[PDB]
Symmetry: C2
């Protein structure tokens, strides 16, 4: 049931933003007793945090498939492109992730989950860049991730300015910049 | 003037509780006016939100246009992009509300239009600066620079204590350095 609720929340949020994800609306979409929800989560914020944790765990599993050695540029691109709205699935994910990032302004649990998530991805990016002798690796890693997050935010609210082919070109350009001075 | 007072109340509510807290009734309550007074100016909550967003983007663009460009592009780019970073309380509030509207833009055509126009305007100015100095891939690097400030602002929302102004300014300086690599400039 809690997994079902997390999927149902993501589904509502992608459709109608997080303002649509009332305890009531999430129940309809999964099955389930409005009490069944209350059984698993004592607060709405608990329910949101669980959904975010689910989305993050799925993202990290995806990074682990695509970021598997060999050419650094291609690995960095495959990983960062998971965060960009390049198809309908990733457009929904980007929408929901951005929504959680704004909701973190008023929710310490969501802010902490995001902080740990960014720390994890950033450390992974840093390890890649250090391994190839990149100048200012850690700072550049932070910048790569921040820039990808910003591109995703910019794109969801203005898709005509950020078609997938443009997003892919912009990510290529950013990666090329980050790798300047690396070997290779 | 009256719609402007309502836009200011909306911003005050949104900076506190997000845009979820910015119902017509909550905005009316914060402004000290009747629901009827609000509905008089705004036919819909959409129109209320769009007007508030326009008010905000006007303020931001006015600040960007006040940047002294002079003869040093790195300095000008830093001064301009610093205005879009949460380096103090006022800009932290602006970041929170602007990010909220960006997210709402995913489902609201009126907000998307205002966001698109804003991004187009800013990218155009940044591209002019970069082309002016022979920056490789100037247009895309302009879009990347703007994305950097947007992404850094987004993260600083949830963890403001961890993104102090000096961290944000350092990150921005490093990105500008990368953006200017291969441009006709003299460091
Ligand atoms: C220093 C180096 C880097 C420099 C970076 C430069 C950034 C450039 C910003 C300055 C330009 C501001 O110019 C401003 O553009 C916006 C469009 O976005 C216009 O605004 C127009 O669209 C908006 C948004 O839909 C409406 O709310 C507004 O009523 C309408 O007039 C303003 O009428 C114009 O005065
Ligand atoms: C005609 C007067 N001006 C200020 C130009 C436009 C009025 C519409 S407004 O206030 O919503 O920009
Ligand atoms: C409501 C408080 N928020 C912004 C969610 C968390 C603060 C995290 S902090 O202290 O590291 O900036």
């Amino acid at each position: 049931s809690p997994e079902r609720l997390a999927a149902a929340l993501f589904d509502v949020a992608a459709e109608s933003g997080l303002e649509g994800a009332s305890v009531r609306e999430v129940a309809k979409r999964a099955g389930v007793s409005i009490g069944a929800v209350q059984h698993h989560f004592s607060t709405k914020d608990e329910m949101f945090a669980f959904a975010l944790r689910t989305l993050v765990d799925k993202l990290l599993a995806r990074l682990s498939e695509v970021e598997r050695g060999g050419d650094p540029a291609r690995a960095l691109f495959a990983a960062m492109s998971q965060l960009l709205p390049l198809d309908e699935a990733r457009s929904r994910e980007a929408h929901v992730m951005a929504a959680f990032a704004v909701r973190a302004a008023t929710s310490p649990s969501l802010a902490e989950i995001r902080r740990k998530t960014l720390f994890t991805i950033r450390t992974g990016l840093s390890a890649v860049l250090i391994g190839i002798g990149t100048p200012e690796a850690e700072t550049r890693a932070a910048l790569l991730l921040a820039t990808v997050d910003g591109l995703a935010l910019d794109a969801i609210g203005s898709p005509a300015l950020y078609p997938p082919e443009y997003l892919e070109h912009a990510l290529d350009i950013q990666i090329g910049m980050i790798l300047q001075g690396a070997d290779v």
